[PDB]
Design a protein around this ligand. Structure first.
Ligand SMILES: *[C@@H]1O[C@H](CO)[C@@H](O)[C@H](O)[C@H]1NC(C)=O
Ligand SMILES: *[C@@H]1O[C@H](CO)[C@@H](O)[C@H](O)[C@H]1NC(C)=O
Ligand SMILES: *[C@@H]1O[C@H](CO)[C@@H](O)[C@H](O)[C@H]1NC(C)=O
Ligand SMILES: *[C@@H]1O[C@H](CO)[C@@H](O)[C@H](O)[C@H]1NC(C)=O
Ligand SMILES: *[C@@H]1O[C@H](CO)[C@@H](O)[C@H](O)[C@H]1NC(C)=O
Ligand SMILES: *[C@@H]1O[C@H](CO)[C@@H](O)[C@H](O)[C@H]1NC(C)=O
Lengths: 316, 171, 171, 316, 171, 316
């Protein structure tokens, strides 16, 4: 006449690992590393800006691709492989620093620097940057000599940040296909453009010479930039080979930027993004993408790590 | 696996138990039966749940790019970035493999603990009226009908009232 | 919390004990009293301090600036620096929260262990002269005056002297 | 006639966290994250140098702020927000590397490179760096043409590191307000100054042009520097726009540098510093300042983490 | 050290046992002897081996130079590299001392467990035919020749066959 | 008649550490931190290339040290302290990036860019780089004016990466001891060499002036380089002070590079290398060299950390 104690079990448990052996069968376990991606930019609730064909730095200078994006405003900014920062071939010096800035900017608000000038042409244009016919960077101006080979008045321009936030100033240098046609543009002689705020000093020389054709042309503008701080001044001492900023840029607030190739989806919420979609998971670890950004589980090397939620499974 | 009960002196468990984790199976006058001990079961599940809320949990720490999938950054800073990411990756892969190995050893043994806690608490009620069978049962040396079994299952059973019957029934 | 004693078959503890961690409460001819078991208490205290010297402890690893609070460095290396520091911060916040959860589970269970080791070491003194009442007491079925209690409290109590008496006092 | 065992308890314990529960009540616990700062630079026992209004890089060049700091010697170096590296407005190229060097240098010991000159002026001066009247960087020299608009002899000078420790050589470039007054100083034409040790080669051109007024003047010196190694020589080939090193700097030993805004205190010992004071603690973790330096507890996100030192507290 | 057995209620161990970890020391008619319990010993060794294969193990993650022993890199990126390496060094030195402190506490205690697991299962074989002497031995109150102890160590011993003899020899 | 249980022990245990104790004696323990080095580059099974006296970057340009190394092929690349990247004194701009590339390249495969030229001499040579008599960098060519001070034709040259792997292009600039002798080489006037792919734009100026004698000379060539990508062109617009690439370099596969001063040994296998040999160990941690590379145990600060493999050792 007796009583026995015992515990439950089942036909197949789940195998897990312990400090002392590999593959103990437990009643129930649960996964701890996320493997399932969902292939969309889960963007519900957030002010999103898919730049598409506009390059992020293009929002500062304004090639035709970026005309809808010169004063954007976002919680989340998506860059695309097809996007270009440029119309007239060229590049930004110190470029990724500018991107990491813009990505977290929550958008940009433009404002003129007011510049007018005397003794120059201000309206140079190109077949690369097409709007109606040949055009140019919306936010900048090709400054030239009045007539072929004319002297470029040695000029100085200054803008002061009237605001209580720091500005983004961007100028550029025109490297002409030849020293010959450097002259047809900006006149003759050694060409000096010099640029100092007061927390920054530096100066620039053009660099004419052959380059292979890109958008048809063999010339390059290389854009430069510095963050001007409140009640600071920036002075532009220059002689030619200059593309001049019409408007400065100010940053709106906070955001996060990502790079991706999958569709926006406003039915989905998510805070962990990678280029192939969104990691929706409450699990501590993930094996999807080690460069995921946002608020993510930790990337681990392991495909799987099972956590026991029941006792040892002993059957007969 | 520690504490000696599960996969131990209690040789294998019960697929027939679907009401909980730990149970009693009696055999008396009317015959066999079975019933699951809620409170011991609930202590295990509640403790496992504690762990599950510890780890199915939310870092709110935001990280951003310093890196670039479309226009690779210059290669010296790239290599330092990749070197740093991979070192940090090694750390978290070590921590993960170790954390869950550690809690799995604690989980398994935690359950075994709750049985030894149950065994040697009914033996404490049954005082001198029963004996250790060896493999997880008590030979109750006196008759305990289906009402005196619910007596032990819900921690009521008075041993003195069956004391004297049992003492020389054993001899 | 493992081992089954504290917050277990010893239903709640003693605010009246101020001399140590673990104690005896007797009741005999003269009446009640209490006294704290040094040697078991000291084993817990000495084990907790072992932990306390493991962690309130001083690394001699010096770290320097790579960073600047007054004239910010250029922003690419700044972002790599901030990215690295924050990854490192995540690691140590994880390690700290986990270390202290881990040492707390071990601490709590460490104390309960020292009780089950105390209970089941006086039962071994009293061999056949007593039985466990269920919730942490021994019914000593023979008389034990205040000199026979200090017998138990300091490992002297001889069983066979009260053996004769106790066996049939039991029946 | 019986015996009972038990354990102690208390009216209120301290609640802690475990692997399986949050807020278990235990008899006694103790904190593990340091939150208490003391708002001073605990500096007892150590050779301290509070630079105050002298910028750390000013110790190499020697503007009036730094006259008391040209040959300093320290275990601990404190930089201050008010400190300036400069008198005549300007910058150091590659600057933070120089600071991280000086901070850990344990001080600097100067020594002349002996330079003499023929055919130039050696003594240019300015109202920015005043001592008695207009002066200049104590450790450098404004090299000019003999008289207005005169030729600057194409000169080359060299210094050899006679010592068994590496030296810091620092020269500079004068960017003049205009090409006009570039000439009044250093004569006319393209100005080239060239600088190679042998483990280092490079060269420099001035860059005259307007910049906004700073200390009154709109010109800039931008200083440059190299680590010259033992029995090595550095050669200075130059034609103008040159500010020339009088003395080289050698480093004394070891130190730790911090930058802070709180008072030194020689009644207090401490090895963990941040800008708002000193963290005295034996605790493993701290929640005070994640950029603390020295020998510190590790920064963690959490304000508090309690470590049990007693058993579970069960009352009635 | 938990579980109460090793450096506990079994006062010190046996240098004479070279056949295993846990053993029986008997004394009967013919006199003393000893023999080691394979099955308990193998459970410890097999569990320690599990740990040893978890940790004597092979990461396949390759790391390369971003650093240079012959022509030192520029001083800013050097300091960031050295700062990063040293932070990561601190982490792994923390993890290493903590892991093996952790595995050592578990190692010491699991072995002590396997003793309490053995003690407390031969006492269940011996039912009512013996008593806990206090110091890790059972006084068999009946005669047990050299085959009657090969019965226990091989988990065969029937207690009912010596029960009747033992019942009165105890009294 | 009775039965006792017990456990084994020994005369001397090993002392270990626990969560609660320091120096407890356990029966048996085993070490966990590797301390034993093997003072050789354990290279068995692997295609090894010990550059010896050739500098890794010398494999691109080809000074006499590197004649045996211009098209090498390796699983493992060993640099040596005695190795030189250069014969005519000089340096690489952006140098360590090139090294980290070559180290992991698995070797280099050269290929001509085919360039011929008209109106210049192509064969300038020096006593620093001697083979038979005075010679020059095998993979490059000193471009000069036909005869003393003759004009250097303003030239355009281009190379297209025909392959489906990215190329290494390397050119350099000659900084002459004086502007005087700049002229005897490449004629007179401002000297401009400009270089743009399409993914990279830039240009260069010589910088003549004195520097101290090294290999006999007081002149310097500074080499530059860019990764040209498939189907892309780089154009070389230049007027003088140019050393021109004859062959471009392509990467063979994968490898690992190390720096060391100990002997190769093909009798021992190993995957963890440092400059003083090879760490052969299956242990999780090492205390040998914190800059070890390959597949290594983790560097820890501690000399030793013992792991218990037996029970508590209790004797009498
Ligand atoms: C900037 O200048 C104006 C001058 O009227 C002043 O009101 C303001 O406080 C200054 N400071 C900042 C931070 O803008
Ligand atoms: C860094 O890693 C990514 C993949 O994680 C790789 O695509 C990239 O090429 C690496 N950087 C360099 C310089 O090789
Ligand atoms: C890096 O973090 C600090 C605070 O820890 C912040 O002040 C600084 O601005 C950050 N850097 C950048 C580039 O935002
Ligand atoms: C420096 O120069 C002297 C030459 O007389 C020499 O003896 C010494 O060894 C050289 N090198 C060093 C490192 O001192
Ligand atoms: C970085 O560390 C190495 C050794 O780990 C040392 O030789 C080197 O000098 C350090 N960097 C600097 C700038 O001192
Ligand atoms: C490069 O050019 C050839 C020209 O026919 C073409 O077939 C090839 O697909 C191109 N693309 C690449 C990646 O080489």
């Amino acid at each position: 006449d007796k009583i026995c104690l015992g515990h439950h079990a089942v036909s197949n448990g789940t195998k897990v690992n312990t400090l002392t052996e590999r593959g103990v069968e437990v009643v129930n376990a649960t996964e701890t590393v996320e493997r399932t991606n969902i292939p969309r930019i889960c963007s519900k609730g957030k002010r999103t800006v898919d730049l598409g064909q506009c390059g992020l730095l293009g929002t500062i200078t304004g090639p035709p691709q970026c005309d809808q994006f010169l004063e954007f405003s976002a919680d989340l900014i998506i860059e695309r492989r097809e996007g270009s920062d440029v119309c007239y071939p060229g590049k930004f010096v110190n470029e990724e620093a500018l991107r990491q800035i813009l990505r977290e900017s929550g958008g940009i608000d433009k404002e003129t620097m007011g510049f007018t000038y005397n003794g120059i042409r201000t309206n140079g244009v190109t077949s690369a940057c097409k709007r109606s016919g040949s055009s140019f960077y919306a936010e900048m101006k090709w400054l030239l000599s009045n007539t072929d080979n004319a002297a470029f008045p040695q000029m100085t321009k200054s803008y002061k940040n009237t605001r209580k936030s720091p500005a983004i100033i961007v100028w550029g240098i025109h490297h002409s296909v030849s020293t010959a046609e450097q002259t047809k543009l900006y006149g003759s002689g050694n060409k000096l453009v010099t640029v100092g705020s007061s927390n920054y000093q530096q100066s620039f020389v053009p660099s004419p010479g052959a380059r292979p054709q890109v958008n048809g042309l063999s010339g390059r503008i290389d854009f430069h930039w510095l963050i001007l701080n409140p009640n600071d001044t920036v002075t532009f001492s220059f002689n030619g080979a200059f593309i001049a900023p019409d408007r400065a840029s100010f940053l709106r607030g906070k955001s996060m930027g990502i790079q991706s190739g999958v569709q926006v989806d406003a039915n989905c919420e998510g805070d962990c993004y990678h280029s192939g979609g969104t990691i929706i998971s409450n699990l501590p670890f993930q094996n999807i993408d080690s460069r995921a950004v946002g608020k993510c589980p930790r990337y681990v090397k392991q495909r799987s790590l099972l956590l026991a939620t029941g006792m040892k499974n002993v059957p007969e | 696996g520690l504490f000696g009960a599960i996969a131990g002196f209690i040789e294998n468990g019960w697929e027939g138990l679907i009401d909980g984790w730990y149970g009693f199976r009696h055999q008396n006058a009317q015959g066999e039966g079975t019933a699951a001990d809620y409170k011991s079961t609930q202590s295990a599940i509640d403790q496992i749940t504690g762990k599950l809320n510890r780890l199915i949990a939310k870092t709110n720490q935001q990280f951003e790019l310093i890196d670039n999938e479309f226009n690779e950054v210059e290669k010296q800073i790239g290599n330092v970035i990749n070197w740093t990411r991979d070192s940090i990756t090694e750390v978290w892969s070590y921590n993960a493999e170790l954390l869950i190995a550690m809690e799995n050893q604690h989980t398994i043994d935690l359950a075994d603990s709750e049985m030894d806690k149950l065994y040697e608490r009914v033996k404490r009620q049954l005082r001198e009226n029963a004996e250790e069978d060896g493999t997880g049962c008590f030979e109750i040396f006196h008759k305990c009908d289906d009402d005196c079994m619910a007596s032990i299952r819900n921690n009521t059973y008075d041993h003195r009232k069956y004391r004297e019957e049992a003492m020389q029934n054993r001899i």
